[PDB]
Amino acid sequence: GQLIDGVWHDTWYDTKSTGGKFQRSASAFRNWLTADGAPGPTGTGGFIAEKDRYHLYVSLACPWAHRTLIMRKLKGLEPFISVSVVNPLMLENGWTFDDSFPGATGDTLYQNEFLYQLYLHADPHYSGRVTVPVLWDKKNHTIVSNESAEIIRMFNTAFDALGAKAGDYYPPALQTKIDELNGWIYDTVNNGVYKAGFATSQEAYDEAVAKVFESLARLEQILGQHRYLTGNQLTEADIRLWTTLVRFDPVYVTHFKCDKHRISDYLNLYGFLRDIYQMPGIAETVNFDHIRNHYFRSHKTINPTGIISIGPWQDLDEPHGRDVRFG
Amino acid sequence: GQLIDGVWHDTWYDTKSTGGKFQRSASAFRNWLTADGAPGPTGTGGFIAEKDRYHLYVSLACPWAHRTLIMRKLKGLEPFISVSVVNPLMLENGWTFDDSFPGATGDTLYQNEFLYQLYLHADPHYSGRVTVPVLWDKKNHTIVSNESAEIIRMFNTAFDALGAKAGDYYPPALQTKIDELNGWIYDTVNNGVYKAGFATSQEAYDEAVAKVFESLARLEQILGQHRYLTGNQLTEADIRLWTTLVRFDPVYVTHFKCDKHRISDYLNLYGFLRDIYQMPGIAETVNFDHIRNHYFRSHKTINPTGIISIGPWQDLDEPHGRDVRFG
Numbered sequence: 161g162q163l164i165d166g167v168w169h170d171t172w173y174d175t176k177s178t179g180g181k182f183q184r185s186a187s188a189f190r191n192w193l194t195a196d197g198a199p200g201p202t203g204t205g206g207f208i209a210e211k212d213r214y215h216l217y218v219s220l221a222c223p224w225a226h227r228t229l230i231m232r233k234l235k236g237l238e239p240f241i242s243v244s245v246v247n248p249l250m251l252e253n254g255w256t257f258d259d260s261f262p263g264a265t266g267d268t269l270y271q272n273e274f275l276y277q278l279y280l281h282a283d284p285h286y287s288g289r290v291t292v293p294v295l296w297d298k299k300n301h302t303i304v305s306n307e308s309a310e311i312i313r314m315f316n317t318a319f320d321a322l323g324a325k326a327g328d329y330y331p332p333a334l335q336t337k338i339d340e341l342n343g344w345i346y347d348t349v350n351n352g353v354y355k356a357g358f359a360t361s362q363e364a365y366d367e368a369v370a371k372v373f374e375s376l377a378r379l380e381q382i383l384g385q386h387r388y389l390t391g392n393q394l395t396e397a398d399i400r401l402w403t404t405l406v407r408f409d410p411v412y413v414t415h416f417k418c419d420k421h422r423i424s425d426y427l428n429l430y431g432f433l434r435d436i437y438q439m440p441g442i443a444e445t446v447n448f449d450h451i452r453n454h455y456f457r458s459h460k461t462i463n464p465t466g467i468i469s470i471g472p473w474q475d476l477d478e479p480h481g482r483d484v485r486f487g
Numbered sequence: 488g489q490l491i492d493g494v495w496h497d498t499w500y501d502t503k504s505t506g507g508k509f510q511r512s513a514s515a516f517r518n519w520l521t522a523d524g525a526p527g528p529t530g531t532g533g534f535i536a537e538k539d540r541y542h543l544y545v546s547l548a549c550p551w552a553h554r555t556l557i558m559r560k561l562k563g564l565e566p567f568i569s570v571s572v573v574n575p576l577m578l579e580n581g582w583t584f585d586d587s588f589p590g591a592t593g594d595t596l597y598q599n600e601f602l603y604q605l606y607l608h609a610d611p612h613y614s615g616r617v618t619v620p621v622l623w624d625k626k627n628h629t630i631v632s633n634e635s636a637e638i639i640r641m642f643n644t645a646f647d648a649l650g651a652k653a654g655d656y657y658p659p660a661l662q663t664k665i666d667e668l669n670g671w672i673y674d675t676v677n678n679g680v681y682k683a684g685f686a687t688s689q690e691a692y693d694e695a696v697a698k699v700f701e702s703l704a705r706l707e708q709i710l711g712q713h714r715y716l717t718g719n720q721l722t723e724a725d726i727r728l729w730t731t732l733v734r735f736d737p738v739y740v741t742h743f744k745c746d747k748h749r750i751s752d753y754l755n756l757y758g759f760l761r762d763i764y765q766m767p768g769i770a771e772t773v774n775f776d777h778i779r780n781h782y783f784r785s786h787k788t789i790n791p792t793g794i795i796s797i798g799p800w801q802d803l804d805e806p807h808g809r810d811v812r813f814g
Contacts, residue, residue: 359792373797413746420800
């Protein structure tokens with residue numbers, strides 16, 4: 161992947177290090193959308209929330225981008241944020257606007273051909289990875305943010321005076337708990353599956369995969385005590401976990417060798433999976449062809465044939481009872 | 488891998504064909520152990536049944552070889568047939584007598600170091616596969632047989648006068664049924680998983696994998712009618728299916744991507760699995776370290792890193808009740 165000036169470098173990303181930190185371009189897109197256009201805690205100001213200015217480039221495959229679409233539905237932001245969906249196969253050009261795949265839309269704004277052109281437009285000398293999601297400012301032709309965690313907080317409150325549905329997925333009373341959960345699930349899970357799936361030695365695969373199943377056992381106890389992770393309210397920590405769980409059986413079990421148990425084997429994890437899947441709006445953010453083509457085909461080092469496993473059987477519309485059982 | 492005269496050919500076999508599937512010894516060794524020393528239906532005599540003469544070479548990882556160990560146990564042939572176990576990693580050299588791995592015994596007769604030395608010591612102008620099991624004649628230093636299916640049929644009877652345990656796993660009454668079963672289970676399943684596992688085309692893959700699961704479902708139905716495949720008697724057809732089943736969850740499901748359902752998800756197939764596993768002495772013929780190392784480490788084309796997955800959870804020691812349910 162990678163842009164260097166760029167200067168997309170199809171892989172050569174790049175001649176070692178020797179210079180250096182990709183770079184100054186690291187901190188490049190961390191501004192915040194705010195209710196009044198003041199700067200948020202990083203970046204500059206200027207990004208007041210309003211209709212018809214902001215746009216989301218996403219992949220349906222990627223969990224980081226998924227979470228921005230979920231929060232866009234829950235918050236009722238569709239009237240304010242329009243969306244393009246990159247193509248799911250992410251090869252030597254990185255993400256692409258090819259629309260030959262159902263649900264890939266192409267760049268419905270500028271018709272570029274590659275996501276990296278959005279990034280070059282915003283910054284002709286950019287150096288760094290070219291990722292989804294991107295929260296793009298159509299008035300200034302630039303990137304507000306491409307940090308998924310921070311876009312979800314903007315969406316959580318920045319449009320509140322403009323008509324966003326009532327809802328706080330990070331409310332002050334729960335913030336400390338949510339932050340502990342988020343760091344523990346990042347570590348052992350959202351990114352313990354990736355260390356397993358791309359480990360290169362057995363020792364490494366082993367210690368990763370063990371963290372994954374130890375965290376899933378712990379989660380199964382917490383979600384056996386109440387409907388969501390912190391209690392009976394849905395938070396951003398549940399949304400983050402859910403985007404990993406919804407891909408676990410279609411891909412991580414077989415693709416990443418996370419294969420001790422399927423999520424369908426855990427009573428509480430699997431009920432939590434359907435419970436959120438069944439919230440009005442959310443099913444339609446889920447596109448399994450994209451998720452499956454993306455992981456199976458894009459990672460040639462892991463899966464040289466590019467064959468897509470027929471996949472663990474399951475059915476996420478089965479009723480779950482969790483709205484009643486607890487409390 | 489393969490011998491050519493030979494003349495072991497590491498991997499290359501090779502740059503062209505034009506006739507054909509090697510060769511005049513593509514039967515190889517098809518002699519029979521008989522209670523009198525007369526020729527069996529193929530091959531020559533005089534391999535009379537007796538003690539201190541015959542030896543099996545096998546891998547614990549390989550199902551054709553595994554069935555010979557099970558029939559050795561069921562029939563009480565320990566005092567008649569001594570055993571050597573090749574190493575589970577089958578690389579450039581094919582099977583090997585490397586002995587640095589619990590339960591791999593090295594060649595305990597001649598301390599050869601490669602299996603192909605045995606086949607050459609016995610035909611030095613030999614052309615074809617160098618496979619386990621091999622039933623070896625310590626007297627004449629030659630191979631009676633390397634045909635699994637015939638070795639196990641010799642074991643039914645050749646040693647009864649000399650004191651084998653009672654049992655006949657290929658009885659005339661059941662042979663027609665047994666032969667039909669042996670056929671479709673080979674087509675659609677024992678081979679079906681290798682087909683899916685080695686497909687290069689996605690379309691090949693889909694086709695193989697679907698046939699696997701259509702056979703599992705047919706089996707799960709038959710095995711809900713009586714304890715075993717043909718009725719209430721155990722046969723070699725049961726032992727052939729079992730030997731596949733028992734590798735299905737720890738290998739085939741992840742490594743060959745046959746992942747729609749684990750055997751542990753089917754009431755009758757998994758009880759059949761546990762039923763035979765628990766027969767006295769069968770458990771000790773099953774070594775999952777050899778099995779899993781062999782398959783994940785030897786197929787470097789399917790599994791670049793040779794990382795062995797943690798493996799689907801199962802517990803074969805749970806009581807199964809199929810002794811009571813039937814008939």
